[PDB]
Amino acid sequence: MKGDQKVIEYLNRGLRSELTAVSQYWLHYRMLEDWGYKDLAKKWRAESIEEMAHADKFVERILFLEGLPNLQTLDPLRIGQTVKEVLESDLAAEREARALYQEGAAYAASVGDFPSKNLFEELMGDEEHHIDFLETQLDLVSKLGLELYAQHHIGKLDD
Amino acid sequence: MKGDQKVIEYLNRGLRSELTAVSQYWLHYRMLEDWGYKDLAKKWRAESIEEMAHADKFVERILFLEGLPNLQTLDPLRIGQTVKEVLESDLAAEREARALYQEGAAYAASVGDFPSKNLFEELMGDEEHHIDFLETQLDLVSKLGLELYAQHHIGKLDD
Amino acid sequence: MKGDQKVIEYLNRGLRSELTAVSQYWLHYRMLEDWGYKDLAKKWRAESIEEMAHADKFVERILFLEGLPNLQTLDPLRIGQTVKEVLESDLAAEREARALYQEGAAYAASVGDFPSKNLFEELMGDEEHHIDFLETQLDLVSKLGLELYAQHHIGKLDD
Amino acid sequence: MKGDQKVIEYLNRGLRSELTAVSQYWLHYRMLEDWGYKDLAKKWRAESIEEMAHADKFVERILFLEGLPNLQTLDPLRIGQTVKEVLESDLAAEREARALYQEGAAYAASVGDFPSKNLFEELMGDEEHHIDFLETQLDLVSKLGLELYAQHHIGKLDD
Amino acid sequence: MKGDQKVIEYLNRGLRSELTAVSQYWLHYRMLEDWGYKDLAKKWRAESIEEMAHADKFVERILFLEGLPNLQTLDPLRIGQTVKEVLESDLAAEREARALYQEGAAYAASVGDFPSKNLFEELMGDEEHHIDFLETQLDLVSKLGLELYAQHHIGKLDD
Amino acid sequence: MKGDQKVIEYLNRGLRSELTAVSQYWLHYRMLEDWGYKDLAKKWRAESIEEMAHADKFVERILFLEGLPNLQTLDPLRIGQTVKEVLESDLAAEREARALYQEGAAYAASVGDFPSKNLFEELMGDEEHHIDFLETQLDLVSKLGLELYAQHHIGKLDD
Amino acid sequence: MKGDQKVIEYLNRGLRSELTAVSQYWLHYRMLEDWGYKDLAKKWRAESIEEMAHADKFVERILFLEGLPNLQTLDPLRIGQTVKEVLESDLAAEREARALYQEGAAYAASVGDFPSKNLFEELMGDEEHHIDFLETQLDLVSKLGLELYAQHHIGKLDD
Amino acid sequence: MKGDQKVIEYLNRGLRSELTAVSQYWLHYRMLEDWGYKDLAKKWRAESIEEMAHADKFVERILFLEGLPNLQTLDPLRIGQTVKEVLESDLAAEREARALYQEGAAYAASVGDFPSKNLFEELMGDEEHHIDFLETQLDLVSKLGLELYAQHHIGKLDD
Amino acid sequence: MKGDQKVIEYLNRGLRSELTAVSQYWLHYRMLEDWGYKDLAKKWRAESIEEMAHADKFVERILFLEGLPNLQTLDPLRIGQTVKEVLESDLAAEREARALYQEGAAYAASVGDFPSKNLFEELMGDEEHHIDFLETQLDLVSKLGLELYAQHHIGKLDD
Amino acid sequence: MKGDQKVIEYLNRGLRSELTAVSQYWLHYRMLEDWGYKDLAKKWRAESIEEMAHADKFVERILFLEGLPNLQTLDPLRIGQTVKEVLESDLAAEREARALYQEGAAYAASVGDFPSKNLFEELMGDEEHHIDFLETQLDLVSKLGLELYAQHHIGKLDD
Amino acid sequence: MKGDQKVIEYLNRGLRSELTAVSQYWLHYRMLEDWGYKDLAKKWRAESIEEMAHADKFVERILFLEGLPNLQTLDPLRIGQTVKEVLESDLAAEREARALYQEGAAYAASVGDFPSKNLFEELMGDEEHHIDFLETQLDLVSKLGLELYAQHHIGKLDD
Numbered sequence A, B, C, D, E, F, G, H, I, J, K: 001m002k003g004d005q006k007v008i009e010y011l012n013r014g015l016r017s018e019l020t021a022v023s024q025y026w027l028h029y030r031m032l033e034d035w036g037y038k039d040l041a042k043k044w045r046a047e048s049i050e051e052m053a054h055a056d057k058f059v060e061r062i063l064f065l066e067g068l069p070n071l072q073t074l075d076p077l078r079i080g081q082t083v084k085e086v087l088e089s090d091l092a093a094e095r096e097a098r099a100l101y102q103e104g105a106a107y108a109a110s111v112g113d114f115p116s117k118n119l120f121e122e123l124m125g126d127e128e129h130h131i132d133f134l135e136t137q138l139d140l141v142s143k144l145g146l147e148l149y150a151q152h153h154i155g156k157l158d159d
């Protein structure tokens, strides 16, 4: 069905945001695993897979609206080299995603593309849940210190 | 609860749209069965039953808002006499439904009737899924030709 | 995440509305049980627990937006002393809740806080379902009289 | 059955005390969840639900004794801004509940209302168990320091 | 163990009160069955069996305290000739049982026989639950009229 | 085994009584169903089948005693045209059956045919149970009025 | 159904007999338990519950015959203070019950009330089974002496 | 319990009748098996075991009534030497049993020993069922001839 | 929570009383096993374990009230050298425990420590059940002689 | 079987050692629970129950050897008031138990009482396992500090 | 492995002891069965089978140590002709076995054959368990008399 070109543009900007989140969370999952925080690594793997679903939803909507999904590039990655830097890096990216979806939802509503508006509003609520999670971890690092926070999430050793 | 009269009017126009879709999909299901495309007939039966649910949701909302649901008339039916004409007939009807729900949702939002707005936005997304399906079938008829497309969906013979 | 102060205010006004509904439905459940209408008492218990979930959703959102949830006060209770007065008391409260959520949803939409808007629109639809229920009971009391209506819902005696 | 008016006043004071504890524990559950202490949040949610049952027990006894349960107001809430302050706030409240139920039980015994006396004595023992739990948490904070105590109860990360 | 003689006299008075309630409720169960109110008959059969357990509890305590249980006589029965009269007859009896157990409990406490005090307080609470049930049935008769109340509890016809 | 001729006569008079009861209850079952009292209709069907068993027991005994069972005629039917007339019609027939079996049992005892006496005494007790049922329904119609009595037994609507 | 007045009198005399047996067996069950003969106590509990069923059958028949069941008084109790006196006390009561039922059955037969006759003949056979049991226990006490007889039935100690 | 001496005499005459039936049916079972009519032999074994139960019931009643059961002698056996003679022999014995029980039941009723009367009336009905069976077999031999009747009941050959 | 010092002294006296009962019953269990009365040994083992739970209840309450539980000493043990002496020794001890808990409960009530009062009243009732058991065993020894009583409880031989 | 008197003395000294260990571990279990170290409390409860088994084994052996078990007194308790003092207190007691059993085993071996020797050698090995446990906990407190050690064993909060 | 000759001698003396115990317990099992004490017979059968295992353990060890097991002769049997003589006979034999194993264990320890020492110490402990059993039975015969002791163990009659 031919879609509004500017909505398609916002969907492709959202696709690039999600592809950045997928790789930034996956690399941070494998860095947390390499550092030995196996329970933090488990959660970051699961968050990267949640963003993979979001990327797919954008690809599907762009094709339905007869646009061309662009998966060639990502937004710049932010790679942390301590557990606190990983939390901070992912929080900054997720704030930028939320603001993009707020703008995409308002734009789509202004042209009557309510199903696209509802996809951006659904993803904006999911990114505020990711933000809540990341802010909470940084709250614990502030109140307990980074070493008590991270030690709690080392996890179990493999068989 | 007494509703906005113009919202009730949009809900009754949507009810008439859905009653037309129910009968137009059911007659096309039974025409596809009569022609021998039993897998296409199965899908059209299921789409007619999805529109029956949509009609019921409009009847329920109109009564809650103390209006009088009107099931006496349908919009003009479009009856195809080849498989491609059936696809084209149902696509034209479903585009008209989507545009009605886009307008009903915007109107209800402008008067603060957010539950009615959300019913129209939910049905608008479901009709874009029906549109996607119908456009895809016409894409296959364009790329393969009608006879290869239809032959694939003849289905199994009855016991 | 720091939220819009006026949205936080609407969420706290909604929290007070729900805390009033929880206690007003719970007291009416126990009054209906004391009067012997055990099937009406069962339904009012379940409605009070639905409003407990709504109160919790407001507390969670206010904290996420870094506000301070205020559970200290309720709106004035309306306590019925006949079954019809209980129906009327709860209907008047639920109409006031619906109108508050309609205004909170419109305000949050105007500042781009779409997840808060969607929480108010979800609760507004749930309160219209509660309104529908309460209006229907008062319709039956109007058409049958209070004693036939209430006698039907006396229920079973305890073992 | 018409009850002693002063016993009904103690039962209503108890109802206010429990309504305060329900909301103080629930807000503290959601604050501990917001801060990331998910095992402390689980336990405060369960203690709030224990106080909801106590509130219900008072509403039921007041109606049986033909009084009017008053759910309009709470005692002043004490909201803590650190985990230690939440423990201290709830301990102060629960000490005041215990002393009220000690007095309610003695009064009801002095007028022969032994079923009400036994409700106040049952709830006094329950509040001493709550007091023992909160004193134990403060004892751990005193011996280990707040950060070690609170880190132990961060809990597991959500799927 | 040799008991206080006056506590054994209160226990025997209680035994007579329960034997009266067993027979008054059983005759009323069979009268309600004879009249055709099979759901009211089921409930009075179960209340009679509850009073049989109370009678047994008194026989057991009297023998442990080395007294002689007296089952020879009952208090005067009150037999109702309409459903409302059966409710009133059993309410009057149960008010007299409650007042006896209030006095038995106070006496036994004053001589330190706390296990007997606790048997009388347990049975006083049970009789207040019976009193609450019978007051509730009379409340329904007052609000709906006897015929609507009794018709609801006719029950099902036997296979 | 050749039986007493006069006992055989009483057994054949009892067979005619039962054949009348079978058809009078079956026709009243189908009249109650036609009028919409489906729970009364269920009970009357079951009572007609109980009388079918009684008819068969008479046929079996008459043949054992080498008599000729006569199923050609019935006693005059009493057909009610309101629910109260159906109750009254069946009560009058069942009183006549009971009196016949009382006389048959006394006659058979006077000639030493104790197995026939015991068949009449067993059926006389079963007809007093049917009488008890019918008297109870007429008691409820007297105390509640016919419309409250019958409305309670309308039953459930068919799928 | 209006019954023979003198049959009703015999049924009420039988009801008083059974109410005496219920309480005399229950008190002897609890005396045997208090003395430590737990297997004798089990059997006496079960015999008291058999007499409770017999009392109920008299109440049901008296109401069917439109009489007034009288549960106000018992025949004089016979309370044993050794195991042999308990056996002797219950045997004397049960002989008096059997003779009453023999007379009630003969009277009811003389007026044609065969269902009442059969209730008295059924209870007379059950009381001869109780007599057989009690005579057998006294036979064992005669042949073995009371202490060997009673020691065998001390039973098992409670967990 | 000391019984009526003449009732005891009738019970002992009935015991002798049953002991004769047990042995006469058992010998005929084994003669029918020896002749090869295995289905007739099965039925005669089962009838002999039914008479064993009847003999035991007489022994039990005689002892309860403090008489001395006499199992020393039987009534003269009638031994058939063809299948028809076996049927005829057992029919003549069973007619004599039925007449004895008719007289025993009338005698016991005349002295008020209703439980003994009911044992004789129960056995008289069971012997009329045995008579019915035996008369039916002789009816088939009369209508089909002995060889067709007996051939049908040869049965299956043993593994 | 800081407790009343004199209530803590009664709780410690109770703890000493229970520690004495645990060891007196356990030594008596092993003496009855040594003598071969295996069913009496099973029951004394279980009563000792009941007193272990009572001891624990006192240690828990004393620590909650911030006292120091004293397990260093026992009251003087009474060791029996025959089965009758073991019964008498344990009865004397349990009478002293019961009187202590009667006094502890009255004292705690007089200072408003109702949870401690209720622990002493619960244990007073439990010790009256122990007293009833031991009095019953002595009653059997008095009526049957010690050898018949003890032989019944020798029990089964081990595999 | 009459045992060596000095072996019996060593068994009674061992019984006193175990009774001291039972109460010292049980009081420390309840102190650790009161302080909030629920996983340490679980382990100390289990160790106290292991010592209860050891006490019982001494009672059984002393009775077999015809001695008199003495449970009247304990060795002086050592009560810790920090987690490290509890570990130290129990280690000092368990070293004294091990040395007693080493001496008892050598003595019993010198008089040929090999089953008693093997009971002391079995308990000496079990007390070295308890020593190993306690030394390991004190090793962790030395290497990590008391607060890290104890925080790890706080455990889970109760439902 | 070639063993110490004197250890082999002690093992063969122990084998002869066990073969004597096997046959002496088996003959006493069958004498107790013949006299009718079926529960004593069951226990003696099981004890004979325990000694069969002990005999086998000696045969196995003697062969491992390259000796020649000698099963040709037994020690003199002691055959009781009353239940008390059977108990006394088996106790005297088992005391002699225990003393032999005490000496065998000390001898084997003196030559370093610790596995043989441990076999003798294991059997010495098992024979002290058999001694305990037998002494206990003789204790019961002393306190109750032989006839009360033996009557308790007559057991159940065979199907």
Ligand code: HEM
Pocket (backbone or CB within 6 Å): C019, C022, C023, C026, C049, C052, C053, C055, C056, C071, D019, D022, D023, D026, D049, D052, D053, D055, D056, D059
């Ligand atoms: C802050 C105000 C309250 C909040 C946020 C709240 C929240 C909740 C929630 C979320 C549940 C369901 C718990 C679950 O299923 O896991 C619940 C249960 C319950 N609440 Fe409340 N509640 C509140 C006030 C009350 C009041 C005022 C009463 C009665 C006076 C009450 C009585 C109950 C009872 C009895 C249940 C358990 C119901 C059952 O298990 O069937 N609640 N509440």
Ligand code: HEM
Pocket (backbone or CB within 6 Å): E019, E022, E023, E026, E049, E052, E053, E055, E056, E059, G019, G022, G023, G026, G049, G052, G053, G055, G056, G071
């Ligand atoms: C009117 C006099 C009484 C009547 C008609 C009566 C009737 C009954 C019936 C029919 C049951 C069996 C209920 C069932 O299984 O559904 C029963 C149970 C019982 N009755 Fe009575 N009863 C009477 C007096 C008593 C007395 C005087 C006592 C004791 C003082 C007693 C104690 C019990 C107990 C304890 C049971 C339940 C037994 C169990 O569940 O194991 N009853 N009674």
Ligand code: HEM
Pocket (backbone or CB within 6 Å): I019, I022, I023, I026, I049, I052, I053, I055, I056, I059, J019, J022, J023, J026, J049, J052, J053, J055, J056, J071
């Ligand atoms: C004579 C001193 C004692 C002896 C011989 C003893 C013996 C025993 C034995 C053998 C058991 C396990 C029972 C079974 O599993 O069948 C046990 C259980 C128990 N004991 Fe003791 N005990 C003694 C003192 C104590 C003391 C002083 C306390 C507490 C103050 C105590 C508290 C318990 C509890 C609570 C259990 C049951 C534990 C459970 O079921 O989880 N015991 N005792």
Ligand SMILES: [Fe+3]
Pocket (backbone or CB within 6 Å): A018, A021, A050, A051, A054, A097, A123, A127
């Ligand atoms: Fe995303």
Ligand SMILES: [Fe+3]
Pocket (backbone or CB within 6 Å): A021, A051, A094, A126, A127, A130
């Ligand atoms: Fe995200």
Ligand SMILES: [Fe+3]
Pocket (backbone or CB within 6 Å): B018, B021, B050, B051, B054, B097, B123, B127
């Ligand atoms: Fe649709």
Ligand SMILES: [Fe+3]
Pocket (backbone or CB within 6 Å): B021, B051, B094, B126, B127, B130
């Ligand atoms: Fe559609």
Ligand SMILES: [Fe+3]
Pocket (backbone or CB within 6 Å): C018, C021, C050, C051, C054, C097, C123, C127
């Ligand atoms: Fe709500």
Ligand SMILES: [Fe+3]
Pocket (backbone or CB within 6 Å): C021, C051, C094, C126, C127, C130
């Ligand atoms: Fe609501």
Ligand SMILES: [Fe+3]
Pocket (backbone or CB within 6 Å): D018, D021, D050, D051, D054, D097, D123, D127
């Ligand atoms: Fe509370």
Ligand SMILES: [Fe+3]
Pocket (backbone or CB within 6 Å): D021, D051, D094, D126, D127, D130
């Ligand atoms: Fe609390």
Ligand SMILES: [Fe+3]
Pocket (backbone or CB within 6 Å): E018, E021, E050, E051, E054, E097, E123, E127
């Ligand atoms: Fe009661």
Ligand SMILES: [Fe+3]
Pocket (backbone or CB within 6 Å): E021, E051, E094, E126, E127, E130
């Ligand atoms: Fe009651």
Ligand SMILES: [Fe+3]
Pocket (backbone or CB within 6 Å): F018, F021, F050, F051, F054, F097, F123, F127
């Ligand atoms: Fe019939």
Ligand SMILES: [Fe+3]
Pocket (backbone or CB within 6 Å): F021, F051, F094, F126, F127, F130
């Ligand atoms: Fe009938």
Ligand SMILES: [Fe+3]
Pocket (backbone or CB within 6 Å): G018, G021, G050, G051, G054, G097, G123, G127
């Ligand atoms: Fe009876």
